[PDB]
Structure formats: structure tokens, C-alpha cells
Design a protein around this ligand. Structure first.
Ligand SMILES: [Mn+2]
Ligand SMILES: [Mn+2]
Length: 429
């Protein structure tokens, strides 16, 4: 009853726009000159639509109007997969009765919604378009430039979208592979609406989000756990890259931590998914990490080909389920078994590593064990989700305290947390 939009969003570094437009014009597509799109998004005084990850707008294109509702979907790197429903309008006034009932979480429009919605923010941008064919798929490329604005608070729009009109998502990823060979693009996880909503709250600074325990569904198989783990790592990378490029220098550490989590997830599932399933991905991650470490500028590091290629490789690996053809019968059997049972086994494996390494004081050699400690914490974050979160986070807190204290050189706190970590018991079966 609902249509499905699939598009890959890249934020474009402002200085790269001309070179990008030039490059797009070599692809041999059907091109359309820029058109002004004027949008007003609507919201209640109590943030009802944002609460359900839904966006309601009226779009104007030279006096022609369209109402669009998008609802909660999936965002994986730059790839937005959202159910949507579009309705042609005769003038810029909402007609909420024309939307299907499936739009609503309830199955009925709230009685006072039309009465309580107000214009919350606008987007005003010029969109230039190229239609291209890739294999048996058709893709609309859009280059958008303008503003998103909520009263006094505005920010620039400068972005590129590859929307799948029909065919396979693999085609969108194939097209993306050509474009990230030049600098100036980064995958964007924030919709224009998400940014508008944030501006409308007074554009508060975004805070670093420490990774917490992954909670996977009760009866999930190991493959579902794997997917959730990589989704989490990619989401943490996206989130902190966005904060870093917007000026939060402390977010750099968290970008590197998220890339580390990707590596640790590959190790964790390495008894099932062979190492050769991720050779190229891991090579790209290495070059990205080196670029980030030596960068003088977040902008340069984030818009680099090293970062862009690594991120696209991860997005493609995850969305295409690239591990699947590498699995022999034994691996297929193991990946289809219980994630809960898998996690209990691996919790013990990582606990044994933590116990053997940190049972004794290490003097001046703690920093040498950071990679091991970080791997084990990351692995336990991915595995501990079927237990009481208060108990499991409390157990992890001591190891996390140790890791922090080692990283910052706090001698007293190192020994404190090492003792706390060694005195606590396991929480798992
Ligand atoms: Mn879009
Ligand atoms: Mn679109």
C-alpha cells in the first residue's frame, strides 16, 4: 500500500561542486537544468511526526504542488530506504485524508492532527538532474544546492543523491563506485528533514554517542546478529564523522573507534565468515585509518578518496550480504543457528582473554595491551545483549574504565579499575 524509495545520499564538499557537475556531464545521461524546489515541512507543537521518524511536506515546483509523507525505514551509511506516498495537490494546503491508513502507526489519522500542525521548517534548493542507465536499472542523479531553514536557524544544502527508479540496489552501489574515485563526497545519513527538525530545536550541538550493548531480537540467528553488528558499526562511523566534519574534534577518536568495531566484528564472526570475504574491505579500512591519523583537517580526511572508498566498501559489503557466497555448508549451518547460544560461547572466549592479560599489574606496559582490551570490550558490546542491560553494562563499565585510564595515563585509576574488573563475576550462562 506504500511505495518504497531507495536512494544513496552524498554530502558534497562545497569546493568540489563544479568538478562534480563536470564529471556527471561525462556520463552520457539525460540532463535537466536546475529547478527551484520550495518545501514546507509540517509538525505538531509536541514533535509527533519526528517521534515516528516520519516527515510531512508540501513541495512546490514552479507553482505545481505535491504532498509527500515519508515514514520510518532503514538508513545504512548513505543508503536511505523509506516507504513514501506522494499526492498531487491543486494548491499548497494539506489533504491528510488522501494518505493511506498504513501511513499512520495507529491505522487512523489522529483527530486533531490537521488542526495542530504548523510549518516547522523549509527547504529551498536548486536541483539539477541526470538520468542514467546502469545494467537493467534506471537511476536519477540529483545535485541539490540551497538551504534548510527553521526560523532564524539555517544551514547549507550541498548534496548528491542517486535514486533507484527501478531495478536493483546493486546498480546504485555500482554507480557510486565510479564517483568516489574523486574527492569531495561523503555518505550522508541525515535526511533534509532530520536536519530541519534539529534546526527547529535551536540547532543544539550534537553530542558524542558512546557505543552501548547491541540488543538483537530474541530468536535471531547468528546471521541476524552479524547484520546488526555491522549496521551498528557503520551507524557509529556515520554519526561521528558527521560530528567531526561539523567541528567536534573529539569525534575523531570515535570515528577511529567505529572503524575498529568493524574490524573486531570481522574477527568475532571469523569462525564462520572466512578472512578472504573481507580482504579488500580491510585493505581499504587500513588506508582510511592512516589518512585520518595524519590529517591536518577533518574536511580533507572525511572527503578523501581513502575514506570514501572504505565507507562505500563497507556499505556495499553489508547491503549486498557479501559474506554469503563464501559460506560452505558447515558455515551456513553455524550462521543459521541461535545468536544467543553463539554469544554465550564467545562471551567466555573474550572473558578468558581479559582475565589472562589483566590478572596482574602491568607497570609501564599497559598501553601495549590497548588493542587487545579494545577488541574484547567491542566484542562483548556486540555479544552481551540477551542479559539484563544494567548488570551487563555494570560489568563492562569496569573494563571501559580501565581502557580509559590506560589511554589517558591515569596510574591510580588503572589499578582501581583493574582490581574492580578482576573482582567481579561473569553475568552470562
Ligand atoms: Mn532525497
Ligand atoms: Mn528522492
Amino acid at each position: 500500500a506504500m511505495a518504497q524509495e531507495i536512494e544513496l545520499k552524498f554530502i558534497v564538499n562545497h569546493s568540489a561542486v563544479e568538478a562534480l557537475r563536470d564529471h556527471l556531464n561525462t556520463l552520457g545521461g539525460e540532463h535537466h537544468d536546475p529547478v527551484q524546489l520550495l518545501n514546507i515541512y509540517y509538525e505538531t507543537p509536541d514533535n509527533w511526526l519526528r517521534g515516528h521518524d516520519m516527515g510531512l511536506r508540501i513541495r512546490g515546483e514552479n507553482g505545481r504542488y505535491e504532498m509527500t509523507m515519508k515514514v520510518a525505514g532503514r538508513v545504512t551509511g548513505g543508503l536511505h530506504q523509506r516507504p513514501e506516498y506522494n499526492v498531487a495537490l491543486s494548491e499548497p494546503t494539506l489533504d491528510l485524508a488522501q494518505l493511506p491508513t498504513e501511513v499512520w502507526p495507529n491505522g487512523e489519522l489522529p483527530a486533531d492532527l490537521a488542526s495542530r500542525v504548523q510549518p516547522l521548517f523549509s527547504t529551498d534548493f536548486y536541483r539539477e538532474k541526470w538520468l542514467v542507465a546502469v545494467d537493467d536499472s534506471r537511476i536519477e542523479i540529483a545535485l541539490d544546492q540551497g538551504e534548510v531553514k527553521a526560523g532564524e536557524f539555517a544551514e547549507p544544502i550541498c548534496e548528491l543523491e542517486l535514486e533507484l527508479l527501478s531495478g536493483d540496489t546493486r546498480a546504485v552501489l555500482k554507480l557510486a563506485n565510479q564517483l568516489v574515485s574523486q574527492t569531495g563526497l561523503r555518505q550522508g545519513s541525515l535526511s533534509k528533514a532530520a536536519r530541519g527538525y534539529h534546526l527547529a530545536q535551536g540547532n543544539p550541538a550534537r553530542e558524542i554517542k558512546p557505543t552501548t550493548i547491541l540488543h538483537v531480537a530474541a530468536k535471531a540467528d547468528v546471521e541476524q546478529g552479524l547484520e546488526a553488528a555491522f549496521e551498528l558499526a557503520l551507524a557509529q562511523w556515520q554519526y561521528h564523522e558527521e560530528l567531526w566534519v561539523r567541528g567536534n574534534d573529539a569525534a575523531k577518536e570515535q570515528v577511529l573507534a567505529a572503524i575498529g568495531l568493524v574490524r573486531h566484528a570481522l574477527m568475532l564472526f571469523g569462525g564462520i565468515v572466512p578472512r578472504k570475504a573481507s580482504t579488500h574491505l580491510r585493505d581499504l579500512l587500513t588506508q582510511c585509518e592512516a589518512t585520518i591519523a595524519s590529517a591536518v583537517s577533518a574536511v580533507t580526511a572525511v572527503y578523501s578518496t581513502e575514506t570514501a572508498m572504505a565507507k562505500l566498501a563497507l556499505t556495499e559489503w553489508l547491503v549486498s550480504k557479501a559474506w554469503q557466497p563464501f559460506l560452505d555448508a558447515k558455515a551456513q549451518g553455524k550462521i543459521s543457528d541461535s545468536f544467543k547460544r553463539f554469544a554465550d560461547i564467545h562471551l567466555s572466549r573474550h572473558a578468558a582473554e581479559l582475565k589472562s592479560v589483566f590478572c596482574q599489574p602491568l607497570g609501564d606496559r599497559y598501553h601495549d595491551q590497548l588493542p587487545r582490551l579494545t577488541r574484547d570490550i567491542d566484542s562483548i558490546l556486540l555479544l552481551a545483549g540477551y542479559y539484563d542491560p544494567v548488570v551487563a553494562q555494570a560489568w563492562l563499565e569496569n573494563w571501559q574504565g580501565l581502557r580509559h585510564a590506560i589511554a589517558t595515563g591515569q596510574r591510580i585509576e588503572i589499578e582501581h579499575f583493574r582490581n574492580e574488573a578482576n573482582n567481579q563475576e561473569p553475568f552470562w550462562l
